[PDB]
């Protein structure tokens, strides 16, 4: 029940792409992954400049800070969460129906821990430099990540549908 897609972008395109996703997807809540703590804080600052509420969570924080933020997220205080690879036992927030890999992971085990489990969309931002990791992860998981279509069926991720 998670539909996986990729957009092909360059680093300089990623934010405009992300703004278009925010604009056109029927997001209830979303989780956005980056490949480091520093880039997480950078993207949270940027999402806030584009107009969207977000929280953020990363490896360089006290555990209890992270727990409270995530409890505040679960209760709907913000609509988007920006984070690093914090999930071990899966994502059990029901309202999250769109997960975004702002940075594509390197390892298949990283990718699995991001994408289990939003009905939901997993949208991958793929650069030329991610090409080997895309192939490796597709092969290891036994999965296909399809190109993002111009119209995403609402029945794939909006629960009223």
């Amino acid at each position: 029940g998670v539909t996986q897609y990729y957009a092909y972008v360059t680093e300089r395109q990623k934010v405009h792409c992300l703004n278009t996703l925010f604009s056109r997807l029927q997001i209830n809540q979303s989780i956005i992954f980056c490949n480091s703590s520093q880039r997480v804080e950078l993207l949270a600052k940027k999402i806030s400049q584009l107009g969207y509420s977000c929280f953020y969570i990363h490896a360089k924080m006290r555990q209890e800070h992270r727990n409270r933020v995530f409890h505040d997220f679960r209760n709907g205080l913000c609509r988007n969460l920006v984070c690093t690879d914090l999930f071990t036992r899966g994502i059990d927030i029901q309202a999250v129906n769109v997960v975004i890999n702002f940075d594509f992971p390197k390892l298949a085990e990283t990718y699995l821990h991001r994408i289990g489990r939003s009905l939901g969309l997993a949208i991958n931002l793929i650069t030329y430099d991610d090409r080997f990791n895309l192939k490796s992860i597709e092969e290891q998981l036994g999965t296909e990540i399809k190109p993002i279509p111009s119209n995403i069926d609402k029945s794939l991720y909006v629960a009223e549908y």
Partner: peptide
């Protein structure tokens, strides 16, 4: 930082990546 006034062109940009052809090149040479 670069944000045009129009929606991001997903479709044009996906034409810049011939996924199945790249993968085959990867398997052949890389």
């Amino acid at each position: 930082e670069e944000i045009p006034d129009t929606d991001f062109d997903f479709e044009g940009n996906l034409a810049l990546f011939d996924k199945a052809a790249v993968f085959e090149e990867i398997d052949t040479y890389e």
